[model samples]
Target: SSQLIPNISPDSFTVAASTGMLSGKSHEMLYDAETGRKISQLDWKIKNVAILKGDISWDPYSFLTLNARGWTSLASGSGNMDDYAWMNENQSEWTDHSSHPATNVNHANEYDLNVKGWLLQDENYKAGITAGYQETRFSWTATGGSYSYNNGAYTGNFPKGVRVIGYNQRFSMPYIGLAGQYRINDFELNALFKFSDWVRAHDNDEHYMRDLTFREKTSGSRYYGTVINAGYYVTPNAKVFAEFTYSKYDEGKGGTQTIDKNSGDSVSIGGDAAGISNKNYTVTAGLQYRFGG
Candidate 1:
């Protein structure tokens, strides 16, 4: 008969976002003396935001298994960015909005749900697959700054001309994978090929209660991509793994109407509805470990 194996085990882990992401703040002021118009106090702050997640899993069968996981993350900025300027030929408002840059801030939330299955019909080989879904939302507030075209202190609504935006993504992919165990040994090898489609909500609207009110802007199309992963085990408790992923994004055409924060009056701003299209690639290798092996 087969060896008596252990029963179900519970485990938990903490997930974190990218740490080396780019983050910065900048400001500028321009005075068009000829036009008697000044452009000042244009400041911006940007940082690659991320999330953290936690989950648990279990083994239910010697040849067949099932698992589920839940994760949540609060994505925010890691550093402060202060950049602002003012432009007024009259010099009346010159010192009005003059000051150091302000810190950059973004509010985002993320959640995930994943399910996996493994079947080891052959002692020398194991086959399995996994599927997961995730969603994220981001928002920002503007306070203590100036205009991008002119120099002046900003004191209207916190995010005078600032607006909030976000995107929702969903994907499901199946993998055909294989793994083998060395006889009388703890060493192992595994590989998997995954085809994934990432679909995003391509609608841009600024409804504060919902997200924000966006005008003269554009949304984009759902992105599609693929990923591959492989790994080798040094022991049943530790392993080295690597992965590569690729995807493409297409801009969309959309617009909305809102009051100009400065003028507090309805204004018509030309919209670009669509911008640039691009591709992204990523690769990573790392060590993973499990206890009680």
Candidate 2:
């Protein structure tokens, strides 16, 4: 999402430059519960993000011009995550009260990276296009700790009967996209469509085996997603923004169910299609402003 800055009239051979920064902080509240071996509680996760961007334009002719802008964000946060059990138990094991246990994980981190760039301009009423690529690399690892119950005492590690439940993973994603803008009268309408591919990879054999039958330890997997946005300028320096986005992901490895020749019990191993699919979606909305030029 972004704001368009008004530039000096192009009739004269002039140059314009602008820079802006946004920073803020807020608080939140939460509530929950705890029972048996699981001590459920409300967790508040705080986030801080800072962005700085600059634009430079040179106009020497009334009908021709060039424009370029660059932006990046420094983001960091620390907080508790929702108390949801990492569902790894399979249908057959759901009734096995003696061998099935519940597990949950939390995460936190801080990261910085160059995120966006732009270059384009238009003349008269003809159409013009702008192309830019933004790359963000932020890595977050699972934090806090895992808790379980066996016999009578409480445990902090992977417990028996709970195979491959608690684990940690990491990765990053860089986004790039193209946009077109049309200018007429006091209103300028713009459309931006971009796709971001998550570079992060992690393994989930434990998750796969417990959730799906004929599953094995997945070697690891990668993540990916896409985004589209449309906005109109309400004022030269301000714009209200709305965007819709979708993402597609493929878990790295697939597993299969087979009988252990020796024990005659069902066992899953990683390598082939395990008959499971993992994918999801995300959407956002906000406001933007231009302060320089």
Candidate 3:
């Protein structure tokens, strides 16, 4: 979308500023790493939280377009965190479980760098192959909630108002796929579908109650993402736009676990290194500044 970039050449570019809410749910699982039996789970849903985002796109030639975008949390997002320890291989029976009434996202951030080679270009349509690298990182803290043990044989408060667990994770993913745009009478629609050959992830988990910590990394992860955006020109050099995005990260084998974040202790454990997967849904709306050809 040249409506928002500088006039570096005959082709125009665009710069966009946006603010929105990001809301999603995610789960972390610990299994037999070898037998794949469910051992424990931590799951939570994020509240609608404020975010600051911006993007820029450039078309240096009729056949090439480059874009970059980044976003971060502008406010603390809070939610409920539920923890479960399963007794059955199928995860049908839980030995212990807890639900925290309150937890918070300390921070969330992401950036994307992409290049698209236009296979077809015209006044009304553009289609191309897209390649991109993206990175995302976030951290959250868990406080007290209700706890139950042995299928309700014992139930009580989970250390009300005390910080219990801390989690932080980072992911690196590079992808290639298709991207396209279509325009008609001051209205434009765009789409992107991309998949990563491999995704790399690293994380740290801490249990303050147990006085324990673990670090894990897995490189054999996979991910896929899709996006759709629509814009209506409020004027020739400006437009109001909305976007929908969904991404999924999957299949990180149990890698290896180390007990120390500082010293190299090898009380290692798990199959692919206890698995990690994430599903995200993001929506954004913003205005862009455009330079017309």
The candidate scoring highest on TM-score is: 3
Ten residues in a row with the worst lDDT in model 1?
A: 14-23
Off by over 4 Å in 1: 1-50, 58-75, 79-105, 117-129, 142-198, 202-212, 215-220, 224-293
Candidates in order have lDDT scores of 0.37, 0.34, 0.78
> What lDDT tens digits, residue by residue, belong to model 1 across residues 159-262?
43333222222222222223232222333344433333333433222334343333433333344445444545564544455544444444332333455444
TM-scores vs. true structure, each candidate? 0.41, 0.36, 0.90
lDDT of 3 by residue, 1-293 (tens): 55532123447687887788777666677777556677788886677767777988887776887889888999778766889998756557778898886788877888999998989977778899999899987777889888888888999987667888888777798889998988876788889998996898877788778667867677868899898889887777777899877888885756556565456455887455476667776788998886636
RMSD of 3: 3.5
5: Cα error in model 1, Å: 13
Candidate 3 has what TM-score? Answer: 0.90
How big is the positional error of residue 192 in model 3, measured in Å on the Cα after superposition? 0.9
Q: Model 3: which ten-residue window has the lowest total lDDT?
A: 1-10
Specify the highest-lDDT model's number.
3
**Evaluation by lDDT, superior candidate among 2 and 3:** 3
